[model samples]
Target: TTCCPSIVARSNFNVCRLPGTPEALCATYTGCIIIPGATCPGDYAN
Candidate 1:
């Protein structure tokens, strides 16, 4: 019998990437927005 290991990665806002085993996942920045409860200033609704 054999067992396989799996890993999972996650980001704070919205960014998730899975490359491969023994390889670091790459996260490409898309865009950012300020929310009410977020640390960023301004309103996301704007």
Candidate 2:
């Protein structure tokens, strides 16, 4: 998926972009900055 399931992307994150975007200040449930479609940091489902 391009983003997290449901509203997890915008509802709980600061930024979302492709895996090879720029690796800037962005992340999801985990505090680690990563693209949505990429794998989570062992904190959530793929």
Candidate 3:
């Protein structure tokens, strides 16, 4: 199983709110998982 670093920002955990395809958002909203060893972006970083 993979794991992502702790999301420091609220939006980072809820990427569904970010700009993207509606279907993607729906999928993410339903169940989103960040890839393992992934690092948060600047805006998402704490």
Candidate 4:
């Protein structure tokens, strides 16, 4: 789980050596950051 957390990290959140990758600005339905495979954040994420 190297991906920067949406709750913390917003953009330029590089992980997996993906420094060039852009972080989703508005994460409405996700954790799609950190774990990238974990459940959504609370209920707001959904």
Candidate 5:
């Protein structure tokens, strides 16, 4: 998923599980999956 550091840096992303779907974070969170075939954002060390 695409991450805008300016937005995510302000909050700690929340994880959730939807019915018939895998666990993921909210849209406001940086690491959340917003689109299909998307990948999670990397950490500073990465």
Candidate 6:
């Protein structure tokens, strides 16, 4: 989720399901793929 004063802001960083659509959460809450394409740091195109 996003981090800010709005209790969470923008989103859409590859929610999940793409490489193969495995488990129930794209990978698992304990296996993998907890956010494959969610590592940009900031500047989401403003």
Query: What would the per-residue lDDT of candidate 4 be over residues 1-46, giving only the tens digit for each residue?
Result: 2333443443323342254443443222224454456554553242
14-38 per-residue lDDT for model 1 (tens digits) = 2322333221223223233322453
Clashes of each: 0, 0, 0, 0, 1, 0
Estimated TM-score per prediction?
0.16, 0.22, 0.21, 0.20, 0.20, 0.17
Report every candidate's CA lDDT: 0.25, 0.41, 0.41, 0.38, 0.38, 0.31
Better of 2 and 3 by TM-score: 2
Evaluation by TM-score, superior candidate among 2 and 6: 2
lDDT of 2 at 41: 42
Give the residue spans of candidate 1 off by over 4 A.
Answer: 1-30, 39-46
Pairs with steric clashes in candidate 6: none
- Candidate no. 6 TM-score: 0.17
lDDT per residue as tens, model 2, 1-46: 2233344544444343444434344443423444556654444443
User: Which runs of model 3 end up more than 4 angstroms from their true locations?
Assistant: 1-21, 32-46
Candidates 2 and 4 compared by TM-score, better number: 2
Q: Residue 15 error for model 3, in Å?
A: 18
Write the residue-wise lDDT of candidate 6 on 1-46 in tens digits. 2221121122222334335444445334323323335553334221
User: On a 0 to 100 scale, what is the lDDT of residue 38 in model 4?
Assistant: 54
On the 0 to 100 scale, the lDDT of residue 45 in model 3 is 39
- Model 6 RMSD in angstroms: 10.6
Query: Over all chains combined, what TM-score does candidate 5 have?
Result: 0.20
TM-score for predicted model 4 compared with the true structure: 0.20
Residue-wise lDDT of candidate 5 within 1-46, one digit each (tens)? 4343444442443323333233344444344335454554553211
